[PDB]
Write a protein that binds this ligand. Structure first.
Ligand SMILES: O=C(O)C(=O)Nc1ccccc1C(=O)O
Length: 297
């Protein structure tokens, strides 16, 4: 059991070592394209790249490079797209990706300013009356509404492919209290956001992969995807002890680098998945307990 391992790691304070183990076992595959000189201004960190195998390719002819990776979880039957926070030059690539990959939702786990620095472009409209149009990829984008909570906001956006005048709705889920290189205020808070997401149809298979990003597309996003996939795995079986989290993390590792930046993030992931297991194991009343605790309003 994870509860047992948790309490054993925790007892001898070995989270750091465990985490180090992970970093050390993880897959290293090439990122040749990402390191092409024409893509310098496309990546936001020297050090966080999409592996070639798993990268998402734009359907442009010019340059198909986006810093984004499909994480495709086979056994859990759930894909996501992890990306960095769009640069001012790639905001139009980001929405082309969402257009082409056919995504329903975008989860933003970061604030555009964090820790004094601009972590991410303002890539969606913050108001009504003033849409965006990305000339380079021929897409228009409009705020339709938003539902501001204490720690997160759900936006409904309209995306049109101005070449065909096809339109689609995108749910944006913005977690605004997950500190960069940190963990959320509590498991109840995280699991309450996670389930807003789920409820909404975004992570469902009639749709393309949910786009998940923070600033880099690795710490925060890996942290999210990890809990989700672990809950989904236990869900099919109703068998928690078939879930190995560190092994799950290593399957994601194969598809994007750096998924989960710290050992407290790892630790938080066990907390999240052990708590949510309540709900997967038929106590559906915990889901509103999460909402109380959460102070969503
Ligand atoms: O945005 C995150 O959550 C994350 O993974 N961040 C980062 C990861 C790698 C390098 C830099 C950052 C950063 O934001 O400075």
């Amino acid at each position: 059991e994870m509860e047992k391992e948790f309490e054993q790691i925790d007892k001898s304070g070995s989270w750091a070592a465990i985490y180090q183990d992970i970093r050390h076992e993880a897959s290293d595959f090439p990122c040749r394209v990402a390191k092409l000189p024409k893509n310098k201004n496309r990546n936001r960190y020297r050090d966080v790249s999409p592996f070639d195998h798993s990268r998402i390719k734009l359907h442009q002819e010019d340059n198909d490079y986006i810093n984004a990776s499909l994480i495709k979880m086979e056994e859990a039957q759930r894909s996501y797209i992890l990306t960095q926070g769009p640069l001012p030059n790639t905001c139009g690539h980001f929405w082309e990706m969402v257009w082409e990959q056919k995504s329903r939702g975008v989860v933003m786990l970061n604030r555009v300013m964090e820790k004094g620095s601009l972590k991410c472009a303002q890539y969606w409209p913050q108001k009504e009356e003033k849409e965006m149009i990305f000339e380079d990829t021929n897409l228009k984008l409009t705020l339709i509404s938003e539902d501001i909570k204490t720690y997160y906001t759900v936006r409904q956006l309209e995306l049109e492919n101005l070449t065909t005048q096809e339109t689609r709705e995108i749910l944006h889920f913005h977690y605004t209290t997950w500190p960069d290189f940190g963990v959320p205020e509590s498991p109840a808070s995280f699991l309450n956001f996670l389930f807003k997401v789920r409820e909404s149809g975004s992570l469902s298979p009639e749709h393309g992969p949910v786009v998940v990003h923070c600033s880099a597309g690795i710490g925060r996003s890996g942290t999210f995807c990890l809990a989700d996939t672990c809950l989904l795995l236990m869900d099919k079986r109703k068998d928690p002890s078939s879930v190995d989290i560190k092994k799950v993390l290593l399957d994601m590792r194969k598809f994007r680098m750096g998924l989960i930046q710290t050992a407290d993030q790892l630790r938080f992931s066990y907390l999240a998945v052990i708590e949510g297991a309540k709900f997967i194991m038929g106590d559906s009343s915990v889901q509103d307990q999460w909402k109380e605790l959460s102070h969503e309003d």
